[PDB]
Amino acid sequence: SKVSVAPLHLESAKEPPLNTYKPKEPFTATIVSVESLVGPKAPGETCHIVIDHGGNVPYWEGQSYGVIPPGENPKKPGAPQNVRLYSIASTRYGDNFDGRTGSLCVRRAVYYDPETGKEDPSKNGVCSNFLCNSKPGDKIQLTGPSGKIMLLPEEDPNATHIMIATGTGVAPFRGYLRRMFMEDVPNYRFGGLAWLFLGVANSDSLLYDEEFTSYLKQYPDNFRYDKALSREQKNRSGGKMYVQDKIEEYSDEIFKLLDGGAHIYFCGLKGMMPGIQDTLKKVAERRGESWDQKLAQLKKNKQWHVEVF
Ligand SMILES: Cc1cc2nc3c(=O)[nH]c(=O)nc-3n(C[C@H](O)[C@H](O)[C@H](O)COP(=O)(O)OP(=O)(O)OC[C@H]3O[C@@H](n4cnc5c(N)ncnc54)[C@H](O)[C@@H]3O)c2cc1C
Ligand SMILES: [Mg+2]
Numbered sequence: 001s002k003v004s005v006a007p008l009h010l011e012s013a014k015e016p017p018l019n020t021y022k023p024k025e026p027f028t029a030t031i032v033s034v035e036s037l038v039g040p041k042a043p044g045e046t047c048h049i050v051i052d053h054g055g056n057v058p059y060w061e062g063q064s065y066g067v068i069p070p071g072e073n074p075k076k077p078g079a080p081q082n083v084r085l086y087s088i089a090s091t092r093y094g095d096n097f098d099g100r101t102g103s104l105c106v107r108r109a110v111y112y113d114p115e116t117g118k119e120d121p122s123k124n125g126v127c128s129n130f131l132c133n134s135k136p137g138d139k140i141q142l143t144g145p146s147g148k149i150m151l152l153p154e155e156d157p158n159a160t161h162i163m164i165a166t167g168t169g170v171a172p173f174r175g176y177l178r179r180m181f182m183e184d185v186p187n188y189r190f191g192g193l194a195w196l197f198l199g200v201a202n203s204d205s206l207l208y209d210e211e212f213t214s215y216l217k218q219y220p221d222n223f224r225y226d227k228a229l230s231r232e233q234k235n236r237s238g239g240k241m242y243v244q245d246k247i248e249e250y251s252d253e254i255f256k257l258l259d260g261g262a263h264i265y266f267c268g269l270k271g272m273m274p275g276i277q278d279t280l281k282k283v284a285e286r287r288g289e290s291w292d293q294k295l296a297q298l299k300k301n302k303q304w305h306v307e308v309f
Contacts, residue, residue, distance in 0.1 A: 001218075002184035005093040011187050016060045017145055023083055026068055026141035029053045031134045032101055039204030046168060046207060047132040049104040050095055057142055059102060061175040062150035063088055066143035067104075069127040083143055084127040087150075087171035087267065087307070091178045105171040105207065106131045150307045152176050153263060158192040160262035162254060164243055164276065166199040169268020169308070170207050181215045181223065192222065193257070199228040199243035199272070226250075244275035251283040263303050270308040 021027045032050040057065070066083035073079040086104045094101035109125025112118065134140070150172050153159065161180075163173040173196055180190040194215075200206055206227070215223040226246050233241035235248075247254060258264060266273065277291075284291040298304045 003097055003182055005091075005097045005099075005183045005185065007099050008186075010058060010092050010099050011185070013058075016063065016148060016151060017058055018148075019144060019146060020057055021143050023066070023068060023080070023143055026066075026143050027053065027057050029057070029140050029142045031136055031138040031140060032096075033136060034132060034134050036132075037105070037207050041202055041204035043201050043205065044108055044110060045132060046105060046107045046205070048089070049106060049131055049134065050101050051104065051140060051142070052101050053142060055100055057102070057145065058099070059088055059092060059145035061088075061091055061152050061179055062172045063145040063147045065102065065104065065145055067127055067131065068141040068143065069130045070141075071126070081126065085144075085146065085309075086131075087168065088145070089171035089174045091175050091183060093183060097183070104131065105168045105174070107168050108132050147307070149305055150265065150267065152179070153302070154188055156192070157188060157190055160193040160257050160260065161195070162257060162262055162264040163194065163196045164247070164264065164266045164272075165197065166243060166268035166272050167205075168207075169266075170196075170198055172267055172307070173265070174208050174211070177212070177215060177223070181219055182211075190222070193224065193262075194222060195224040195226075195257075197226050197228070197243050197246050199230060199246075199268075202229055202231045205229075242275060243272060244279045247276060248279045251279065255280075255283050255287070258298060258303065261301070261303065263305060264298070265305040267307050268309075273306070273308055 030052045032052050034047055034049050037046050037048050064085045064087050066085050068083055069081045071081055073081055088102050089105040090103040093099050095103050106128050109128045111120050111123035165173055180194055212225050216225050228241045228243045228246045230240040230242055235241045235245035281291040284294050
């Protein structure tokens, strides 16, 4: 049932790779495919991009690639564009199970005049649209990989991993979960609990939903999956249903799991964290506990993993 992956020597490295390529001399990779992940009612396009790096830019799950879009620095004429980082959405073996490709999950950044709604492409995001406009065979300047915060702790193969995502923040967790449930990795047999919370605008904006629902069916005792559809569901107080409200619904069992040593991960909108904090704070305090002190402990114990942007 698990998918054969190759080559097994990608397991050999003792330490994550870091900054194998830097902006001064990037790696010229090649697009394999680009597809929309969303339906017509989504507020914007998010695309899945598969990139052939030829085995020249390996990474571990949870890392990022940098992309240098073409053109010159608009601020610094006679200079290349700055790097944009993207969370890698694939396992180290990639979507072709062969160790040659990695994938990105990219939301197009588009500008709309606040009053008239007139879109203005001159104010669109350069790199996000460059990527989702890409076609098979196009060349892309890759840097990295980078990142350590979102590496998956594998010391306990029966650990609990609580994953909190908004939008493209799902990307690392797609990689985690394929490694946990889909790929045949003899040196990592996951037997714990993986719990994905995902916040997106509506049903049409769901990302990789089919893949996650399949894990629910295959591994009902090791995978849980909750969704906050902000524009189709209301929280208990009449506002938009956000991931922190879903967390609140399970506040007692999330705290027990954290108390038990669970890892908790946050990726996506930086603006979600104050509400998640608020929500975790209330639970700690009703128990008689300082959240300030508890959060400090969770970080000291290396249980708290944040990459928001
Ligand atoms: C660690 C990390 C991981 C990340 N992972 C992901 C990911 O998985 N997926 C993802 O989609 N993004 C991710 N990002 C964000 C990503 O790096 C980019 O910042 C994002 O794609 C936008 O870059 P851009 O080049 O498209 O926009 P930019 O060209 O950098 O422009 C930024 C914004 O300014 C707006 N803008 C430009 N000109 C004007 C103007 N005149 N008036 C008004 N507005 C203007 C653009 O519309 C855009 O929204 C991540 C960021 C970090 C730090
Ligand atoms: Mg869909």
